[PDB]
Every structure is written in structure tokens, then in C-alpha cells.
Amino acid sequence: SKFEYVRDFEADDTCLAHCWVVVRLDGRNFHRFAEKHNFAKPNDSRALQLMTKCAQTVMEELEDIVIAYGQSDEYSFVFKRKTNWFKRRASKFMTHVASQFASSYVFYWRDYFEDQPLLYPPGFDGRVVVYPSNQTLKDYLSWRQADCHINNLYNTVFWALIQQSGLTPVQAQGRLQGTLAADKNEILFSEFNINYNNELPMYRKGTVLIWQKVDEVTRTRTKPVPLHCDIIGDAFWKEHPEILDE
Amino acid sequence: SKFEYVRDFEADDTCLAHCWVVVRLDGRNFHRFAEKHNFAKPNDSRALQLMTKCAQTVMEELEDIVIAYGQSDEYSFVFKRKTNWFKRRASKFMTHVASQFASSYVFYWRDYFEDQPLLYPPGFDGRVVVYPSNQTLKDYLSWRQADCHINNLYNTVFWALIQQSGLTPVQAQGRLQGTLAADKNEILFSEFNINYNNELPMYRKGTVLIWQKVDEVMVTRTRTKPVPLHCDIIGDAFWKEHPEILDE
Amino acid sequence: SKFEYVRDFEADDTCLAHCWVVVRLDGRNFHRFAEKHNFAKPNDSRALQLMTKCAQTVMEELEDIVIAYGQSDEYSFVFKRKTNWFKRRASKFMTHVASQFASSYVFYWRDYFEDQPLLYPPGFDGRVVVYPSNQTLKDYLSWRQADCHINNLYNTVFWALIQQSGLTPVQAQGRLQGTLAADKNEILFSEFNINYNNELPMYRKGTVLIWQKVTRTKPVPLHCDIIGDAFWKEHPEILDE
Amino acid sequence: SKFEYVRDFEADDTCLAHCWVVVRLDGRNFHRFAEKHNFAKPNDSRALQLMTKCAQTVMEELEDIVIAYGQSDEYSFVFKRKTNWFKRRASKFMTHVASQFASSYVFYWRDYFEDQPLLYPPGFDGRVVVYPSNQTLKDYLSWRQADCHINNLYNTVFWALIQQSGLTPVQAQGRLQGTLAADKNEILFSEFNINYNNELPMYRKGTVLIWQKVDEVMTKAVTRTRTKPVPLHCDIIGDAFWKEHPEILDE
């Protein structure tokens, strides 16, 4: 050899054993991306479904992914805490997730965007977080869902004030400053006759991805099915105890 | 809020300041990929050029990448040592490189494989390495190029024994066991009349990527772009020819 | 300034939040230390108690230490998992523990070694371990106590063959190779009339240090078993806090 | 076994190869320590010399320490960059340095503080820093020496305004607010007739510790020359010092 010594400079990044590993992907410069490709405001079904398809491909090509959660230009994957995949090297986790997701995006672009053409290949960033207890993982997922709900409740009335009322962005943002949750709900209900609760459950709750038994003559295989329910309340977790307790 | 405290569990991964950062991408299970898509043995020009184009896209979309080096199903990118991009968070470096490369691969698949169809989206893995001195970075690049040369010198005669001689893989591997460099060179030169030195410089030396000044008219308009090369990077001549890459 | 930028090269070492931190001190080259100072075989009460006194000083001068466990030439301190001391920088933990222990050793040497003179200042090494659950911390403590018991059971009969039987170390180690627990117990009971079970509780169980009320609270020592659930059911405040 | 698996939770602390390792010890709450033991202001020779002796003991009991630098209640040790001691585990470095220093302090307390009694055992904290080039290590040592010089130049005139002038600390600090280097030097030279250059070289330059060859003669008339960590009080910011001792960096 006489050159292998450089490999000694590789630092270790093994994650603490018996701990949940979480990888969060976030699109890079996706505001400009949605701008160049005429994304629908405040929500675009094509983008959300394509993100879910990429997340399913990621869950299928890798292992030990027990749950995924997605929202506009973001996704999170939770690997099981007792995993031994890649000796718990966070670098492998995040690079595999990012590369697989980014390739699947360009691959399945056409399936969901029949009319729109992809102008350029997008970029993504990732990160790894280690959580020692089940409570902290539950709280992280609840944090993501609450962020989803708040952003959707703001953007719905913001684009209702820009599109159906003809206000510049500065005008709408000055109109919404200082409003509470029920305040925005009432602005919607009384100024546009739009009930926020009637909005699609995929816009105000995000997407969850869990293994379930499908059939397709007969194809009794497991696949990552999506859901659009609340993951902050104990009901979801008491209804699926095997995901956490294993 | 009531939930943001979970963000405290994010550990720091800042790379040592004043140090070369190197990110190496490597295709995952790429043997099966080259199998399913009828890759040419021992080398396929189309695949190598597609990897080089993805690497150029990576060098253009990101910053402070001063050099890249490529080989069969792998690439390495060297960020300048005094960089401050993303506060030197290795996570950002590697995820950005991996994602950009993997998306550019699927995008530009058609440009080089006009007939061949992509069956599935490929996966890639990455890693970060910190090198404190110019000598260590030079030695890492020399290691990659020497590995390239040895693998190509082996695979050339290995596939020459299977294709042009009709030997099963076990037979070719048993015939090549114990051979040296000159041994394989002589087997090739005397049993197949193939001179290894005349082989394409992109197969036995890899690919290097450096910023150079390109002229493009339609006037003599000019701009900088990442050009490829296939020269030796182990000898000081290459570095004496481009001093701006290390001393900046 | 023009020089402060070097401070950027300090790496971060924050321990994972909501996790038990454990610092284990172990004396360096303490074989030669016990050799030059004529330590009692197989155990010396003065030395073990001095280690306990240093550990108490460490528990009092620092914070969030809920328990300590000690044995021949080693000690361990468990900081509470929800601590925020020094922003959970492991470096501060280990350097403070090591320095305080090493200073207290030389300080309180005379109290326990009135006749003996300290020949040189000893050295110590440390380390930090992060445990995510109570079960792993319990298992670590049980590991330490089992190591204590096995080492004491071996050394008792090992020095009994050297002192009361006149055998060289090689002879005793060749005689003890392959013996089980009941094997050593029977060799002791039948060759020296020494019952291992009757041995002092500080030699075959180690030492535990926990806060208790005398009127203010102070770290009292104990010599009971910490592997059995009874110990933890007797002290619920240390685990659930 | 059945319990050793917990050892898997031990994290690694390997230092970057081919890099200078630096351990800096700093006394904990040493303001209160110097207060309770009646330390001399602005500088106390006993404390500084005892710290230097502890640092020498640390340099002798451990290995691969090529240089040490000391200042008020602080010290720094530079291990050789190509070291392999303890497989470059920073924890071992820092814990060994801290424990040895803290024990040597209490041990040799009496040798330098014969009259003063040690009230309690002091505590110390440390840290590890990895430097990739010789320039960064040189700059770190120069940073420490410049900090020493600035603190001593400030404290000299500060305690001259408190002790020989009768000013409260808040008043003296408000009087010193906004003063430059030449300002403090001129206040000292013209209001107290103290020339800063005449001050002891150990106060305005710190302390350096380097291996040098010591000669020594024993009983029975035989002379033996062995290596020992000698102290110095010279400038380490100027290139002259490094040109005079090239073996410390180039090895």
C-alpha cells in the first residue's frame, strides 16, 4: 500500500446505542424551485404526493425505518432504536437517505407532473438526531405536526387575502400581524366563507407513513401506506403499539 | 412552542478550521446496477462521462470546491481549507454533495445512454474526511489514483481472459493469482497483443476536475468552468503546473 | 487581539440531554504505589476509606452527583441525567472530578496514614460514559459490583496461598487456574479455616455513597448489594427524580 | 460477564492525526482561593513558582510534552504532534494532566508556602485543543503571552491606584476606563515613578518550560549531565526565540 494511512483521519460518528435515530430531509432553495415550476398556493397536491412517493421509495430501499412523516418540502424518517445497520454510523444513514430521495425525485417527477417539465435537478440537505427516550421522539413528531398546522393556517388566509381579495404581500402580512389562531379562523370564516376545518386533511395535518398489509391475483405484501391523522394525541400511538414497543 | 426543546439533541459536527475537507461519494451496490444496464467491460465510456457530468454539476451548484477526482462508480470533492460554507458543518457538505449528484445522475441519464433505459433510481453513500496538511491531501489523491491504476490493470487482463479467451471467472481468477504489475502487462502484451500504455488515458488514470478559463464564441467571450483532465496527479509536475489550487 | 481566532479550534463535547453521565476514576500504576507504600494484602482498610473520603469531597464540591461507587483502586460518580451543570460539557466533568479527587488524596493522606509517609504524588485517569436509560446504568453498577466481588474472591485465596501457605505468585496462579466460585470457597474453608462469606462487607461488595439526613444532608457510605432490586426499592428518590 | 455490553457506550476522543495537542489547565474559583490565603497583589512569587514546579512535575511524570507555558493561575502543555501516547485519546491526556497537577499542588504547597497553611484542597479544570499547523500553535502561545502582558500591565496600575492611592475598586476601574497601553505606562511612570520595564521578567512575560541539559555533580567526584525541564522568562512571540531553539518545532 504505502498510502492507506490517510484512512486513519476518518473520525467516528457512531450513534449512541439503544437510542432512536432520526433523519430529516429539507429541500434546498425550494422557494425558487416552486416559483419556477408554478406551484399551487397555498398547497399543491402534486408536490406533496411526489414527496410521499420519494419517501416511500426511501423506506423501501433502506431498512429499519419504522415510521416517516412528511410536509411541504420536508420529510423525517425514524429508524428503530435497537438497529445495527451500518454499525449505527450516522453518515451512512443520512447520505443514503439524501441520495435515494434526490434520485427518486427526478425519477418519479413525470408520474405526478404530466404537464409540467422539470427544469433542473434539485438539491437537498439532511441531518441526524439521536433521541434517548420514546417521549422525546413523540415530542419531536408533535413539534413537526404543530409547525405544519401553524404554517398552513397562516398561509391559507394569507393567500386568500392575496388571491380572492387583491392585496399585495406586504398588505396581507400587515393585515395578519398580531392575529391568534381563532383570529385567523374567524377571518377565514367571515371574510371568505371558508371553514378551515373543511380544508383537505393532507394540508393541515401532513402525511404519516407506516407499514401495512396490502393485497393486489393476490399480493399479500407489506408496503408503506400513508395517513393524515393527528400524531400528537395518544390515540394514534395506543392504536399502533408495535411501532414504539418492540 | 412547548416542543422546540428536542432541537437541543442536535449534536455539533463542525470540521476543524484551516483544514482540507474531502467528501467521497460512492455508488451503492453499483455492481448490480452495472449488471442490469449492460455496462461495457472492462470500462464503459458513457458511464464514466455521466459520472463526470454529475461531478461538474456538483462543483457548480455548491461553493469552494477546488478540485474533484473520479473513478469507477466513485468521486471525491475537495473543499478549500479556509472555507466557511455552512459553518463547516460536515453534515451539510456530505448531504448536499450526495443529493445533488444523485439527482443529476437520474436527470442526465438520457444524454449519454440514448438507447438504454434507467430501470430504477440509484443510491449513493458519502463520507467526510479532514486533512490537516497539503501532504496528506496530496497522498490521498495519489492513493485514489494508484488504486484506479491497479484495478484497471487487473480488470483489463481479467476480462481479456473471459471474453477473448473463453474462461470462466474462477479460471481467470486462478490464472491471475500471484501476478505482479509487469506480470499482467506481459500476459496482455504477449497473449493478446494489447499494450496497456496505449489504452485510453481515462481508463488507467481516472478523471480530474479543475476550474479553468474557457473561451466560447458564437467575439471571444470567456468564463471559468470546471474542465476535466486525465493526467497524473501523483507527481509534483501536476501541482507545479497549477499552483493556485493549493496556495490561495 | 489579532490572535483570538485560535479559540475557534476548541471542539464541542456536550453530552446527550436527558441521559445519565458517569465519570470513572482509576489510579494509574497503582500497583507500584501499593508496592512502595506497603499496602495490606489482600485489602487495606485505610486506603479504601481514604478513597471514600476523596469521593465524598468530590460529591460535596461539585453538583448533581446522586450516587458514587468505589472499589479497590477505582471509583465512579453518577451525575443526575437532567443536569445542566457546565452545559453538560464532559471535559469539565472529568477534569473537575479528577483534579478534586487527586488533591483530596494528598490532602487527607495523613488522616488515615498517620505512620506511613507519602513518597510521591499519585496520578489518576478518568473517562465519561453516557447512558440513555435507567436499566443500562443499573447494569453498569452491577458490572462494577460483580467485578469487585470476583476480584476480592480471587485475591483473598491468592494472597492466602502466598502469606499463610508460602507459595510464589506463579504457584498460586497455576493452582487457581480453572477453579470456580465454590472451588475457591472450599479451598478457603478447608485449607485456612477462613469463610469467605464472613469477610468484611467493604471488601467483597465495594462502597456506595448516597445523600442521607443526619441535621443537614451529607454523603453517607454503605456496603450493601446494589445489583438486587431491593436496594433500589429501598431508595426510590435516586432513580426517579 | 453478562454486563460488559455497557462498555459499548464509551465514546471515542481520538485527536486528529499529524496535529499538535494542547492541554490548558486553569484553576477553578481561584479568585476566592487567592483571597482566602492572602495572595500578594498584583503578583505573588510563591504562587507562580509553585505552579511552575507543579508543571515541571507534570512534564516529567508524563511523556511527549515538548513545551509548557504558564501564567497567573493557568498553564498550557503542548504534546508533540506525531505522538502516539494512549492512541491520542484526549480524555487520557487531560485527566492525567489535571490529576498530576492537582496532587503536586497540595504536595509541594509547603515547600513554597511555609508560613501559609493550605485551608482546603483546590480544584482545577482543563480542556483539549487540536492545532493543525505550527503557525496556529505559535499563535496560541503568543496569544497566551500577550494576554499575560495585558493583564499584568493593567493590574499593576490598578493596584497602584488602590493600594498606594486609596481608591475604591469601582473608582479605579472607572479611572482606567479608556486608557491605552502608553496611557497606563505613563500613569505609572509619572504618578508612581514605576517603570514597567524594570518589573520582574516573570510578571510581564509569564513562564516557559523547555527541556535543556543540566549538569550535576554527586558524592563518592563524578559529574553527570542529564536532561531536565528548565524555566525561562523570555519572549515567545518573536521569531528569534524559535530560531534559537529549532528542535522544539522541527522534529
From Swiss-Prot, chain B:
Mg(2+) 2 binds at residues 26, 73. GO terms for molecular function: ATP binding; GTP binding; guanyl-nucleotide exchange factor activity; identical protein binding; magnesium ion binding; nucleotidyltransferase activity; tRNA binding; tRNA guanylyltransferase activity. Binds 2 magnesium ions per subunit. It is an enzyme of class 2 (transferase). Changing residue 23 to A: In SCAR28; decreased mitochondrial fusion. Pfam families: Thg1, Thg1C. This is Probable tRNA(His) guanylyltransferase. It comes from Homo sapiens (Human).
